[PDB]
Design a protein around this ligand. Structure first.
Ligand SMILES: *OP(=O)(O)OC[C@H]1O[C@@H](n2cnc3c(N)ncnc32)[C@H](O)[C@@H]1O
Length: 637
DNA sequence: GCTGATGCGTC
DNA sequence: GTCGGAC
DNA sequence: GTCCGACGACGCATCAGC
């Protein structure tokens, strides 16, 4: 049948058996996957991407079920289940070395072209005494990626380069483009987890697994009205999405899906302590008015938004405790102190639970929350080891599971009541998030002010009874986050000088994707780098920046511009442009020189979450925010 | 082994 | 983390 | 609203060049 180079999963009236490019029972060719990625990359309509991926997956299900799992992971650019912690350990540097070797070019030449094009894939693809090696297969490429991720220790980079070179030598057509993009962590299809799930549920709905070959049912949706088909696929999609959000692990879900089908899947893969789940997320909301409009017909609660790290705390029946990050990373080992206090935070009647909390640094002498930067510096504190002044404190804000019962479909009013009834607070150790139930604008505004005075970032807002569940599948950003620095005109902005630009990648290829900013150190008469900047401009504004900063490019840096440890710009810029920049906090920096010596001996100051607001056309660089002003902003935190 | 660089997680 | 583009 | 991928500071385990 068909050579894979001609595979077209975007064709009208795609037939999963007749339009595939491999025979039943054989390994899915990687070129089939690459061709699907091509047809996805070529469009901007996400629903067209889903249809195209679904066509590939239908053929995988019909012909080669064992390759469904690797094909899905390749489509997500995942190495496996997130809690297993697999990491390629391949940066652009190592990848470029492998490309240079495979293409027979000097490294600097490949590096410069990759920076200019904004994409390593284009260099690997568009850049033989031996006949080709066997064609790449989807499962074979996936296992090679996992081989790369497993390599560790001295000389491991050399072994990784050998695997990558081996892949590139076997590539044809567009394969090297997507293998290089995968290895760089930037597959950039425009299609990610939500679209992959929609494609998968559509595929197994239209082309059910488990059919003796050839499958008699290849397009089950076909004969329905447009409305009935849409409703049916939505319902099937929700079955998969709700299961995935409770058990975000394709290693678990896919074998069940293939053996038992989608309808039975929830009976086999269930929320359970010890298995990380997807956390509820929050939509940014730029003011109280937007909150009220969003929750127009629903009573809601406001809670302090604590400035720490999420900690999903699992207590299994029998006493084992596990702690997971918001991205399902196993964090159990960072918190032995916490784990030994679990019998202290729960009533004796609690036999199992899943808590949603923020881990925060707490200074027990000052009795106050410390900045996130302090928290990330805390070393693990063994129980029976000597006590230190600052410790991790949990601020609990949700209860997902209790005594063998999932609370995912319960309204927050009930989950919060069970949380408050069944758990016990200890200052500096385990505390319920401070909250207020109101619709009064002035009360909300005063509560927002108080959260900031109490060392928090702002407010989380959550409905209590209407659309108030923990069902990520229904709405992943079911909560709202309201920060003072979202309010334009509110909070501290800086006027900073653009001293450098960085070539853009991906969506920014062909212009500047980032910029190096500086404050003005009056005492030493120098500009000091303070942060980089890569968000806040519209596409049109970024085009304007590219055009006006192009003219200011210098071959060699000005001698009064100090950047110390900052990334050297691709283009140094005549210090001229002054931009208004907003941030959330100021941090003590290990690399930036701004205001060094004014607050800390060895460290300058940088900006947390900086973003572009507007050009200060009226201001000259001498009128930029000074480094003394930067120190003033830091101290008043 | 020493030293500086960095991939990748957190936010 | 923030942000804006495509739908 | 939803989904996606541009881009930020920073800590550190672990890497390569000697
Ligand atoms: O900015 P963001 O989308 O990452 O915000 C969500 C995160 O905020 C943290 N957090 C802190 N305090 C709360 C409360 N009270 N409720 C919910 N989330 C909260 C979480 O870590 C969350 O990921």
């Amino acid at each position: 049948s068909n050579d894979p180079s001609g595979y077209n999963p975007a064709k009208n009236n795609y037939h999963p058996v007749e339009d595939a490019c491999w025979k039943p029972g054989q390994k899915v060719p990687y070129l089939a996957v690459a061709r699907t990625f091509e047809k996805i990359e070529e469009v901007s309509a996400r629903l067209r991407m889903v249809e195209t991926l679904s066509n590939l997956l239908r053929s995988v299900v019909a012909l080669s079920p064992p390759d469904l799992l690797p094909v899905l992971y390749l489509s997500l650019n995942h190495l496996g289940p997130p809690q297993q912690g697999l990491e390629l350990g391949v940066g652009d540097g190592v990848l470029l070395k492998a490309v240079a070797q495979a293409t027979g070019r000097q490294l600097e030449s490949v590096r410069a072209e990759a920076a200019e094009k904004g994409d390593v894939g284009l260099v690997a693809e568009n850049s033989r005494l031996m006949l080709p090696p066997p064609p790449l297969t989807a499962s074979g490429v996936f296992s090679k990626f996992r081989d790369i991720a497993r390599l560790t220790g001295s000389a491991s980079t050399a072994k990784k380069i050998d695997i990558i070179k081996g892949l590139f030598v076997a590539c044809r057509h567009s394969e090297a483009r997507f293998i290089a993009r995968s290895l760089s962590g930037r597959l950039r299809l425009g299609l990610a987890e939500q679209s992959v799930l929609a494609a998968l549920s559509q595929a197994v709905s239209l082309t059910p697994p488990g059919q003796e070959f050839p499958p008699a049912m290849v397009d089950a949706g076909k004969g329905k009205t447009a409305e009935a088909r849409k409703t049916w696929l939505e319902e099937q999609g929700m079955i998969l999405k709700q299961t995935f959000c409770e058990v975000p692990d394709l290693d678990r879900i896919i074998p069940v899906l293939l053996e038992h089908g989608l309808e039975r899947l929830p009976e086999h893969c269930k929320l359970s302590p010890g298995i990380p789940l997807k956390p509820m997320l929050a939509h940014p909301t730029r003011g109280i008015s937007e909150v009220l409009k969003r929750f127009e017909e629903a009573a809601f609660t406001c809670e302090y938004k604590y400035d720490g790290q999420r900690a999903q705390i699992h207590a299994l029946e029998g006493g084992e405790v596990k702690i997971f990050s918001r991205n399902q990373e196993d964090n159990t080992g960072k918190y032995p102190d916490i784990i030994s206090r679990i019998p202290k935070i729960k009533l004796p009647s609690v036999t199992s639970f899943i808590l949603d909390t923020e881990a925060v640094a707490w200074d027990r002498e000052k009795k106050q929350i410390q900045p996130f930067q302090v928290l990330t510096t805390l070393k693990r504190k063994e129980v029976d080891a000597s006590e230190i002044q600052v410790q991790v404190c949990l601020y609990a804000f949700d209860l997902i599971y209790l005594n063998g019962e999932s609370l995912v479909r319960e309204p927050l009013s009930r989950r919060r009541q069970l949380l408050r009834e069944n758990f016990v607070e200890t200052e500096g150790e385990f505390v319920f998030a401070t909250s207020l139930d109101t619709k009064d604008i002035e009360q909300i505004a005063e509560f927002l002010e108080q959260s900031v005075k109490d060392s928090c970032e702002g407010l989380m807002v959550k409905t209590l009874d209407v659309d108030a569940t923990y069902e990520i599948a229904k709405r992943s950003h079911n909560w709202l986050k309201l920060k003072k620095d979202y309010l334009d005109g509110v909070g501290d902005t800086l006027d900073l000088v653009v001293i450098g630009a960085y070539l853009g990648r991906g969506k920014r290829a062909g212009r500047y994707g980032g910029f190096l900013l500086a404050s003005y150190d009056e005492d030493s008469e120098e500009l000091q780098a303070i942060c980089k900047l890569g968000t806040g401009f519209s596409d049109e504004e970024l085009e304007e920046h590219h055009q006006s900063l192009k003219a200011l490019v210098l071959p060699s840096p000005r001698p009064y511009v100090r950047i110390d440890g900052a990334v050297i710009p691709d283009h140094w810029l005549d210090p001229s442009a002054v931009w208004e920049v907003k941030c959330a906090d100021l941090s003590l920096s290990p690399i930036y020189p701004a205001a060094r010596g004014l607050v800390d001996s060895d460290k300058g100051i940088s900006l947390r979450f900086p973003r572009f607001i507007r050009v200060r056309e009226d201001k000259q660089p001498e009128q930029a925010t000074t480094s003394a002003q930067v120190a003033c902003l830091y101290r008043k935190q």
